[PDB]
Design an enzyme around this catalytic site. Structure first.
Site, PDB file in Angstrom:
ATOM      1  N   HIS A  61       0.996  -1.612  -0.052  1.00  0.00           N
ATOM      2  CA  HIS A  61       0.170  -0.057  -0.065  1.00  0.00           C
ATOM      3  C   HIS A  61       0.564   1.150  -0.044  1.00  0.00           C
ATOM      4  O   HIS A  61       0.690   2.508  -0.862  1.00  0.00           O
ATOM      5  CB  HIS A  61      -0.940   0.034   1.327  1.00  0.00           C
ATOM      6  CG  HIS A  61      -2.041  -1.078   1.431  1.00  0.00           C
ATOM      7  ND1 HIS A  61      -2.515  -1.508   0.678  1.00  0.00           N
ATOM      8  CD2 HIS A  61      -1.678  -2.120   1.754  1.00  0.00           C
ATOM      9  CE1 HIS A  61      -3.492  -2.883   0.629  1.00  0.00           C
ATOM     10  NE2 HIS A  61      -2.793  -3.173   2.001  1.00  0.00           N
ATOM     11  N   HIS A  91       5.497   6.502   6.531  1.00  0.00           N
ATOM     12  CA  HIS A  91       5.854   6.719   5.038  1.00  0.00           C
ATOM     13  C   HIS A  91       4.822   7.645   4.988  1.00  0.00           C
ATOM     14  O   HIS A  91       4.910   8.800   5.144  1.00  0.00           O
ATOM     15  CB  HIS A  91       4.220   5.380   5.264  1.00  0.00           C
ATOM     16  CG  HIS A  91       2.918   5.695   6.270  1.00  0.00           C
ATOM     17  ND1 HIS A  91       3.068   5.893   7.737  1.00  0.00           N
ATOM     18  CD2 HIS A  91       1.879   6.031   5.501  1.00  0.00           C
ATOM     19  CE1 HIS A  91       1.698   5.890   7.449  1.00  0.00           C
ATOM     20  NE2 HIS A  91       1.204   6.548   6.559  1.00  0.00           N
ATOM     21  N   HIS A  93       2.306   9.091   1.496  1.00  0.00           N
ATOM     22  CA  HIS A  93       0.430   8.851   0.338  1.00  0.00           C
ATOM     23  C   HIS A  93       1.442   9.815  -0.749  1.00  0.00           C
ATOM     24  O   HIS A  93       1.641  10.485  -0.594  1.00  0.00           O
ATOM     25  CB  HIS A  93      -0.109   9.339   1.134  1.00  0.00           C
ATOM     26  CG  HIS A  93      -0.791   8.402   1.686  1.00  0.00           C
ATOM     27  ND1 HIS A  93      -1.461   7.274   1.896  1.00  0.00           N
ATOM     28  CD2 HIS A  93      -0.702   8.380   3.316  1.00  0.00           C
ATOM     29  CE1 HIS A  93      -1.584   6.136   3.577  1.00  0.00           C
ATOM     30  NE2 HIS A  93      -0.532   7.316   4.304  1.00  0.00           N
ATOM     31  N   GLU A 103      -3.293  13.893   1.602  1.00  0.00           N
ATOM     32  CA  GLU A 103      -4.373  13.086   2.140  1.00  0.00           C
ATOM     33  C   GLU A 103      -5.067  13.798   2.225  1.00  0.00           C
ATOM     34  O   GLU A 103      -6.594  14.074   1.671  1.00  0.00           O
ATOM     35  CB  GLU A 103      -4.126  11.814   2.372  1.00  0.00           C
ATOM     36  CG  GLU A 103      -3.812  10.965   2.615  1.00  0.00           C
ATOM     37  CD  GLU A 103      -4.063   9.011   2.817  1.00  0.00           C
ATOM     38  OE1 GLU A 103      -3.967   9.138   4.244  1.00  0.00           O
ATOM     39  OE2 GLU A 103      -4.214   8.704   2.807  1.00  0.00           O
ATOM     40  N   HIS A 116       3.618  11.082   6.831  1.00  0.00           N
ATOM     41  CA  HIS A 116       3.307  10.535   7.699  1.00  0.00           C
ATOM     42  C   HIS A 116       3.781   9.765   9.173  1.00  0.00           C
ATOM     43  O   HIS A 116       4.905   8.615   8.606  1.00  0.00           O
ATOM     44  CB  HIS A 116       1.618   9.458   8.104  1.00  0.00           C
ATOM     45  CG  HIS A 116       1.041  10.046   7.380  1.00  0.00           C
ATOM     46  ND1 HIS A 116      -0.473   9.279   6.646  1.00  0.00           N
ATOM     47  CD2 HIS A 116       0.369  11.239   7.244  1.00  0.00           C
ATOM     48  CE1 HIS A 116      -1.672  10.691   6.205  1.00  0.00           C
ATOM     49  NE2 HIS A 116      -0.881  11.101   6.402  1.00  0.00           N
ATOM     50  N   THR A 195      -6.345   6.506   8.061  1.00  0.00           N
ATOM     51  CA  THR A 195      -6.609   6.921   6.442  1.00  0.00           C
ATOM     52  C   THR A 195      -6.772   5.111   5.783  1.00  0.00           C
ATOM     53  O   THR A 195      -7.212   5.468   4.537  1.00  0.00           O
ATOM     54  CB  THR A 195      -5.688   8.002   5.753  1.00  0.00           C
ATOM     55  OG1 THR A 195      -4.289   7.277   5.599  1.00  0.00           O
ATOM     56  CG2 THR A 195      -5.605   9.058   6.677  1.00  0.00           C
TER      57      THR A 195
HETATM   58  N1  LIG Z   1      -2.024   6.159   6.971  1.00  0.00           N
HETATM   59  S1  LIG Z   1      -2.117   5.773   8.564  1.00  0.00           S
HETATM   60  O1  LIG Z   1      -2.985   6.167   9.051  1.00  0.00           O
HETATM   61  O2  LIG Z   1      -1.142   7.210   9.233  1.00  0.00           O
HETATM   62  C1  LIG Z   1      -2.077   5.004   8.934  1.00  0.00           C
HETATM   63  C2  LIG Z   1      -1.229   4.682  10.554  1.00  0.00           C
HETATM   64  C3  LIG Z   1      -1.373   3.466  10.267  1.00  0.00           C
HETATM   65  C4  LIG Z   1      -1.340   2.437   9.663  1.00  0.00           C
HETATM   66  C5  LIG Z   1      -1.039   0.624  10.632  1.00  0.00           C
HETATM   67  O3  LIG Z   1       0.017   0.180  10.409  1.00  0.00           O
HETATM   68  N2  LIG Z   1      -2.260  -0.362   9.751  1.00  0.00           N
HETATM   69  C6  LIG Z   1      -1.659  -1.582   9.885  1.00  0.00           C
HETATM   70  C7  LIG Z   1      -1.873  -2.830  11.613  1.00  0.00           C
HETATM   71  C8  LIG Z   1      -3.174  -2.093  12.380  1.00  0.00           C
HETATM   72  C9  LIG Z   1      -4.060  -2.677  13.112  1.00  0.00           C
HETATM   73  C10 LIG Z   1      -2.150  -3.261  13.617  1.00  0.00           C
HETATM   74  C11 LIG Z   1      -2.893  -3.674  15.403  1.00  0.00           C
HETATM   75  C12 LIG Z   1      -3.869  -3.856  15.442  1.00  0.00           C
HETATM   76  C13 LIG Z   1      -4.398  -3.489  14.846  1.00  0.00           C
HETATM   77  C14 LIG Z   1      -4.696  -2.676  13.701  1.00  0.00           C
HETATM   78  C15 LIG Z   1      -3.231  -0.973  11.757  1.00  0.00           C
HETATM   79  C16 LIG Z   1      -2.966  -0.178  10.430  1.00  0.00           C
HETATM   80  C17 LIG Z   1      -2.528   2.696   9.233  1.00  0.00           C
HETATM   81  C18 LIG Z   1      -2.509   3.462   8.408  1.00  0.00           C
HETATM   82 ZN   LIG Z   2      -0.910   7.581   5.928  1.00  0.00          ZN
END
Ligand SMILES: NS(=O)(=O)c1ccc(C(=O)N2CCC(c3ccccc3)CC2)cc1
Ligand SMILES: [Zn+2]
Length: 256
Positions: A61, A91, A93, A103, A116, A195
Site C-alpha cells: 500500500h 510512510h 502517500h 490525503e 505520516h 486513513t
Molecule cells: N495513514 S495512517 O493513518 O498514518 C496509518 C498508520 C498506520 C497504519 C497501520 O500500520 N495499519 C496496519 C496495522 C493495523 C493494526 C495494527 C494493530 C492492531 C490492529 C490494527 C492498523 C493500520 C495504517 C494507516
Molecule cells: Zn498514512
C-alpha cells in the site's frame, strides 16, 4: 482485499469497514479560514535525537521506515497531546502526478505527497492496544511539494530499488527522521482516524503548516514502486491516498 484501484478503492472500503462513514474520519480538507487559533495549545515537542530506524518495508500500500519503539528513543509530546507518544514508523502517500497525492488538503489544495510520522501513546503499552483507543495515536503529517530536493530524504529514495514489490524489506539503520522536517512547527490539529483500513478512529492529527520541498526526481522514484508482489502483473504504486472526508462535528484548531 482493499486497495486504491477502481474496484477496491476508498469508495468501496465501507463495505468491509463500516467505520468508513464514521463521525471522525480522516483525512479532511483544512479550511485555513475556519480553523480557529487556540492560544492554549502548547508548543509541539519533537525529540528524535535518539531515534533508531531498523528497516524499510513495501507493504503493498506504501512503504514504511520502521523504528525501534521498545524504549522512549523518539517521542512526540506537547501540542494538543497529553502524555508521550513513541515513533513507530513513517510512510508517505503520493500521486501519479505532482498535482495530487496528499490525503489532507489545504483550502482544497492537494500537495504532491504527504509524510505520516506515526506515534503511539505509551500509556497503552503497545501499538496494537493503542489503535483501539480514542487517543491511541498521534500522526504528524507533513506536506511535500515539488521543487528543490530534500537532502534528508535521499537515503530513502536510493533504497527503494531494494523493495520494489509487495513484501520486500531491507535493512535501514541510522536514518535520521529530523532531516524530513520543515523549519517551522506551526500546525493544525483535529481528532480523526487512520486513513487506511481498518480506519480506526484512534488518531490525533497534527498537520504542519509548512510543507517540505522534494525534487521531481525524488518523487519520480516513489512512483516506480509496485503495489503488486514479485512475479505478478506490474501495478505502479501511485495515488495511494484517500480523499478528504466530511469534517462533520469537528473543528480544526491552529497553533498559530
Ligand atoms: N495513514 S495512517 O493513518 O498514518 C496509518 C498508520 C498506520 C497504519 C497501520 O500500520 N495499519 C496496519 C496495522 C493495523 C493494526 C495494527 C494493530 C492492531 C490492529 C490494527 C492498523 C493500520 C495504517 C494507516
Ligand atoms: Zn498514512
Amino acid at each position: 482485499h482493499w486497495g486504491y484501484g477502481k474496484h477496491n478503492g476508498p469508495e468501496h472500503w465501507h463495505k468491509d469497514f463500516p467505520i468508513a462513514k464514521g463521525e471522525r474520519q480522516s483525512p479532511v480538507d483544512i479550511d485555513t479560514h475556519t480553523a480557529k487559533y487556540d492560544p492554549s495549545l502548547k508548543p509541539l515537542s519533537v525529540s528524535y535525537d535518539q531515534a533508531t530506524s531498523l528497516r524499510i518495508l513495501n507493504n503493498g500500500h506504501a512503504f514504511n521506515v520502521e523504528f525501534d519503539d521498545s524504549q522512549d528513543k523518539a517521542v512526540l509530546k506537547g501540542g494538543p497531546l497529553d502524555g508521550t507518544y513513541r515513533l513507530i514508523q513513517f510512510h508517505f502517500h503520493w500521486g501519479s502526478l505532482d498535482g495530487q497525492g496528499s490525503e489532507h488538503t489545504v483550502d482544497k489544495k492537494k500537495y504532491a505527497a504527504e509524510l505520516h510520522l506515526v506515534h503511539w501513546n505509551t500509556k497503552y503499552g503497545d501499538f496494537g492496544k493503542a489503535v483501539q483507543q480514542p487517543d491511541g495515536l498521534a500522526v504528524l503529517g507533513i506536506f511535500l511539494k515539488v521543487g528543490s530536493a530534500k537532502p534528508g530524504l535521499q537515503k530513502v529514495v536510493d533504497v527503494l530499488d531494494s523493495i520494489k514489490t509487495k513484501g520486500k524489506s531491507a535493512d535501514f539503520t541510522n536514518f535520521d527522521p529530523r532531516g524530513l522536517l520543515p523549519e517551522s512547527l506551526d500546525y493544525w490539529t483535529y481528532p480523526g482516524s487512520l486513513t487506511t483500513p481498518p480506519l480506526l478512529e484512534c488518531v490525533t492529527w497534527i498537520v504542519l503548516k509548512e510543507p517540505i520541498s522534494v525534487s521531481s526526481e525524488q518523487v519520480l522514484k516513489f512512483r516506480k514502486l509496485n503495489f503488486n508482489g514479485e512475479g505478478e502483473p506490474e501495478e505502479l504504486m501511485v495515488d495511494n491516498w484517500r480523499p478528504a472526508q466530511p469534517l462533520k462535528n469537528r473543528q480544526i484548531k491552529a497553533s498559530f
